[PDB]
Amino acid sequence: NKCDVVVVGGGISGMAAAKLLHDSGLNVVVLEARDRVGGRTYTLRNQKVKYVDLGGSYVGPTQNRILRLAKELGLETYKVNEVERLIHHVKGKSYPFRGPFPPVWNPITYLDHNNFWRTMDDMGREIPSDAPWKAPLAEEWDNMTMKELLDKLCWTESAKQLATLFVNLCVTAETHEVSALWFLWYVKQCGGTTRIISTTNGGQERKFVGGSGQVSERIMDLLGDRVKLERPVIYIDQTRENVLVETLNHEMYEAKYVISAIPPTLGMKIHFNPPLPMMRNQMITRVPLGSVIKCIVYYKEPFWRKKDYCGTMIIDGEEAPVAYTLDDTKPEGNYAAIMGFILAHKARKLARLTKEERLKKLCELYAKVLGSLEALEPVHYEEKNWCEEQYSGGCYTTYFPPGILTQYGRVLRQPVDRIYFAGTETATHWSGYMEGAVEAGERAAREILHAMGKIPEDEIWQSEPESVDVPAQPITTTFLERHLPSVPGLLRLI
Amino acid sequence: NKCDVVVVGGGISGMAAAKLLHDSGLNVVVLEARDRVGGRTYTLRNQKVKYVDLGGSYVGPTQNRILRLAKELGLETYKVNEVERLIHHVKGKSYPFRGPFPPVWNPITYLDHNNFWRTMDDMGREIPSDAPWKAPLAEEWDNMTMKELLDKLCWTESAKQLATLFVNLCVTAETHEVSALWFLWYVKQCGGTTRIISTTNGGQERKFVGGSGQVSERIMDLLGDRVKLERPVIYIDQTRENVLVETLNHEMYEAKYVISAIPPTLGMKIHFNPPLPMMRNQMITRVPLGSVIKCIVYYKEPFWRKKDYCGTMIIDGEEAPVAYTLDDTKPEGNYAAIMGFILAHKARKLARLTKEERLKKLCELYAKVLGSLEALEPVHYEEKNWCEEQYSGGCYTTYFPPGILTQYGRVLRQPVDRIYFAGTETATHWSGYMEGAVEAGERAAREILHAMGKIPEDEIWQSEPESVDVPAQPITTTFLERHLPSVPGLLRLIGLTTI
Ligand SMILES: *[C]C1=C([C])[C]=C2C(=[C]1)N([C][C]([O])[C]([O])[C]([O])[C]OP([O])(=O)OP([O])(=O)O[C][C]1O[C](N3[C]=NC4=C3N=[C]N=C4[N])[C]([O])[C]1[O])C1=NC(=O)[N]C(=O)C1=N2[C]C1=[C][C]=[C][C]=[C]1
Ligand SMILES: *[C]C1=C([C])[C]=C2C(=[C]1)N([C][C]([O])[C]([O])[C]([O])[C]OP([O])(=O)OP([O])(=O)O[C][C]1O[C](N3[C]=NC4=C3N=[C]N=C4[N])[C]([O])[C]1[O])C1=NC(=O)[N]C(=O)C1=N2[C]C1=[C][C]=[C][C]=[C]1
């Protein structure tokens, strides 16, 4: 029954909010729909794998909030293997390379690849992180899919193929499904193309020893009986003095304030009294999450390292079930494994197969790409289709179709009376990530502290000191990268 | 508690299913979220208006199922006023015309307008009504917005402007929001461009005397206590022998079968056990409804008729709050009124204003369009914003953004164990309309009768005899209309001669 704040959802965002409020002296309850905490993070333990992340997993430089929270909880990170060569597999053949970016040798193609990435970052600099709908060309870019943008910008099929794979991997959606404004904002608010795609010095630098699921589990340990598992919220009543929150199993909770820490569209699962205002009522029907199967194949040894491959593969083509892989071997060098993502329309297509049929397709692919028969002899397989989850709706995050961000965007974190909004989707830096979940949960908690007169308005949005354990190198561009002409630019110059 | 079939939703689709099942001898319960039946149809009665439809309203030729159902219930139709001239207002000026279509004088613009409508219908003929994702070019057309299709097809701004207003009016959404495959399907399954847009011989020919809300109300009268108002469904359990359906007010219903007769995305409001299959789970998050305010301004007299205007206005321009109007005077000639739609992004924009501020904007617009100061003296005003409705989500219907129809389309009316799907969105002829609600409700009911061994598979989909009261004239094209070249076609024909 009675408390100061009810938090709906026990993922990273809901747990970070509740921890903050608890640490401030307020009485808090977390209502969680599933029989576990963690939401879009999930760590499986069994004897074969020891532990494995089946949801969110990677952290890296500039993600200072998730790094500080995990450190305080007693977690350690380790580095993803990127010692040996990366592989770019294109038109049925493998090209090993070093550095973050796959090299291009044809000169025209070179100019086209260079101009595409540069243009993405240029366009991003006109987009405010906390208000993308205030971009000078907000409407024009929002009324256009990423597919239309790629068609205009890319003068070669080679650049257009790589840019498409880039979109599919970042947001688990097809280029024709997503707004150009929304995708450019998304990349920008992660620090740009280089920062988002890199292992070393980027979003994929590190993982947590023991799994990322420990973040939510350890906060639940701190909160004890305040966390209520298998309590899906069905009903929120704001007509009276205290807010009334009802669960599916017929319990009633009473509070001064609520934080909703669930993906925006999952707000549909709740019946509101009084009805939601018009813009939010419609927004929550307009914001799907992407589609992905995360798959991990285990091997006796990390045999790719013997051929001077790190295990990172960038794989083009319609036939490949998996477009991107990373080494998932434990820091000690055992439980050798390759992690890969089956993205967007391939997730829909390959979900019809059996677990065993998917394993066979992956092994045959890895054998071609790595040039090794050893890939045909897996010792174990784990996978998770996020599309089938009632209380997630997909992964990694919410995407915006064309027209939606400019029309409904400003409503995402706008309070509805005594309901405040957290969840990674409402963040302004690494929104879509575990980092964004922490930002949003702690910000929504402070909005409530301010409404209670406990802190100045000044203190709702708080900056984060840089991690000493995971420092960031700055992103640099060369003179030639900055000044080489586009393909049409070279044509004008002719 | 116990019955044969629980129907979720008391709109036209849910009420048509329940009536069919009841007439067959089964015990049915209808669970309705609101304190009223009718859903996206709603008839307001007060002394000033007598009655007025604030939601779905128009019916016309080829809509035989809604006409038969209403006739059996004892309802009458009357004809929408189209006796005098239509108006096309473009670039701040009005051009009166007769006939269904605004005339085009410039021969280039004329070739462009002719080729646009023709191409829409040509592309539609490649799209199966019952399976749009089977079109030969389904993927290509689905990966493209209507805005991209218009940019490629229309070689004049004038054709592009009119085509845009056409999309906004048909599906209450912007061209950049909707799949090209979905929109071409939607028009095709209503019988094509002419049938969808027309008053005389089209979708807008008629209304029901007394209002369309009487359809649902009269079925409720037939069913008596079997209809449960203010019972929003929150939970469906299929793990046991009988299906368990729970409501928000804590009642439990038990049944052999369930029909879900709610817009697909409103399925999100229900918690399922076991969880929905993957494709449905994701589909219901990908299918929004459009945005519209329906507004009716009353006058002492239908003064536009005196100037030889019927009251139909097609109004282009960003400044105009309303893009389309119809005479909404009663068949007896009293309660003179103009009905207009505020569509898509304007519904969002103008919802910020007060009721009085919106009234003033409309009157000032009608005064320019009709050239009449009388338009500035309204006697009464009614309106309804559908965007604010928790148990509709918008109006008129569900649209599909790019990429969705080909990936998730085939799952819309696919049964999930003992749950069968009705609602106008699952229809194959006039989906989006009251007609489609009847088709879908009656088909879902017969799917259940078949599962119960009461009818052959053969009988699930049933054709409908043509209405004798509202007959359909066929849609004809002239020789010139069929064979005049497009703009690029004329240009090719100029490249060829010179050589
Ligand atoms: C899935 C995934 C994958 C596969 C991968 C990845 C990911 C994912 N990511 C993402 C993450 O994870 C995220 O962001 C996070 O986690 C989020 O968080 P939040 O905000 O908190 O949210 P969530 O989790 O979802 O939670 C929520 C909750 O709630 C609940 N509910 C619902 N409903 C309800 C409830 N309750 C009560 N009632 C009701 N009604 C649920 O259940 C839950 O719990 C990521 N991230 C990062 O950071 N990293 C990584 O790695 C990741 N991953 C990704 C990527 C990869 C590559 C590149 C990029 C990215
Ligand atoms: C809105 C509108 C307007 C404004 C106009 C119009 C329209 C609309 N339209 C459409 C119609 O109306 C429709 O289609 C119909 O109505 C549909 O039906 P259905 O399918 O049945 O569906 P609904 O109605 O929605 O119902 C449902 C129900 O359910 C319920 N719920 C929900 N949720 C829930 C429930 N319950 C329990 N639980 C839960 N969870 C609700 O409440 C409801 O009741 C139209 N149509 C026609 O035909 N005509 C016309 O006129 C119309 N309009 C239109 C137009 C105009 C112009 C052109 C074109 C068109």
CATH number at residue B187: 1.10.405.10
Which chain B positions have a beta carbon within 8 Å of A234's beta carbon? 234-235, 248, 271
| d(CA A303, ligand 2 centre) in Å | 61
- Cα–chain-centroid distance for residue B237? 32
Closest CA to A326 of A53, A82, A55, A79: A82
Q: Determine, yes or no, domain membership for B451.
A: yes
> Considering the domain boundaries, does residue A466 fall inside one?
no
Is residue B20 within 8 Å of residue B438, measured between CB atoms? Answer: no
Strand A93-97 to strand A85-90: parallel, antiparallel, or no bridges (unpaired)? antiparallel
Nearest residue of B to residue A178, measured between CA atoms: B402
Q: Are residues A366 and A408 in the same domain?
A: no
Q: Chain A contacts of B286, Cβ < 8 Å? A: 288
Q: Which ligand is nearest to the CA of B389?
A: 2
Q: Do B269 and A268 touch (CB under 8 A)?
A: yes
| Pocket flag, ligand 1, residue A58 (CB < 6 Å) | yes
**Continuous H helices in A452-493:** 479-483, 487-492
Residues A172 and A242 in one domain: no
Residues with CB under 6 A from ligand 2: B 8-14, 31-34, 39-41, 55-58, 203, 232-233, 261-263, 266, 269-270, 292, 294, 386, 391-392, 395-397, 423-424, 432-435, 437
Are B99 and B203 within one domain?
yes
Residue A45 sits in the same domain as residue A126: no
Contact B282 A393 (CB under 8 A): yes
**What does the CA dihedral B49, B55, B59, B63 come to, rounded to 10 degrees?**
-150
Among B30, B36, B40, B197, the mutation site with the greatest number of ligand 2 atoms within 8 A of its Cβ is: B40
Q: Is there a single domain that holds both residue B141 and residue B264?
A: no
Q: Which of B197, B221, B256 is the last residue of a domain?
A: B197
Q: Could you tell me if residue B330 is inside a domain?
A: yes
Q: Which of A144, A163, A197 is the last residue of a domain?
A: A197
Q: Is residue A204 part of a domain?
A: yes
Write the single-letter amino acid at A426: T
A176, A234, A265 ranked by CB distance to B403: nearest:
A176
Q: Are residues B457 and B327 in the same domain?
A: no
Q: Which residues of A touch B291 (CB under 8 A)?
A: 282
Q: Which residues in A lie closer than 8 A to residue B265 (C-beta atoms)?
A: 268, 285
Of A361, A382, A400, the residue at which a domain comes to its end is A400
Report which residue type is found at A213: G
- Cα separation values, A490 from A114, A493, B51, Å: 13, 5, 68
Asked whether residue A203 is domain-assigned, the answer is yes
Cα of B56 vs centre of ligand 2, distance in Å, is 6
Query: What's phi and psi for B95, nearest 5 deg?
Result: -125, 100
Chain A residues within 8 A of B289 when measuring between CB atoms? 282, 285
What does the alpha-carbon distance between residue B141 and residue B133 come to, in Å, rounded to a whole number? 10
Q: Which two tokens stand for residue A310?
A: 């790190």
**Ligand 1 centroid – CA A395 distance (Å):** 7
Between the alpha carbon of residue A33 and those of residues A22, A232, A271, B97, the distances in Å are 21, 4, 15, 60
* Residue A120 CB neighbour total at 10 angstroms: 19
Q: Is residue B480 part of a domain?
A: no
Give the range of the structural domain holding residue B6, as residue numbers without chain letter.
Answer: 1-39+61-76+209-287+401-461
Vertex A364 angle, CA A358 and A369, to 5°: 125
Which experimental method was this entry solved with? X-ray
Question: Of the residues B57, B248, B442, which should be mutated to test ligand 2's pocket, given the most ligand atoms within 8 Å of the CB?
Answer: B57
Question: How far is the alpha carbon of B389 from chain A, nearest alpha carbon, in Å?
Answer: 8
Whether the CB-CB separation of B26 and B243 falls below 8 Å is answered with: no
Q: After which residues, if any, is chain A broken (C to N > 2.5 Å)? A: none
- Judgement on whether residues A117 and A88 belong to the same structural domain of the protein: no
B68 plus B2 within the same structural domain:
yes
Q: Indicate the burial class of A102 (C-beta count within 10 angstroms; 0-12, 13-18, 19 or more).
A: middle
Taking each helix axis as running N to C, give the angle between helix B434-451 and helix B12-23, from 0 to 180 degrees, rounded to the nearest 10: 40
**Cβ-based contacts under 8 A for chains A and B:** 122
If one counts the domains in chain B, the total is 3
Instruction: Judge whether B247 lies within some domain.
Output: yes
Q: Are residues B141 and B68 in the same domain?
A: no
Half-sphere exposure of B392 (CA within 13 A, CB side): 24
Asked if residue A396 and residue A292 are part of one domain, the reply reads: yes
Measured distance CA(A229)–CA(A34) in Å, rounded: 6
Q: Domain for residue B28, yes or no?
A: yes
Q: Can you tell me the distance from the alpha carbon of A425 to that of A436, in angstroms, rounded to the nearest whole number? A: 7
Distance CA B29, CA B10 (A): 10
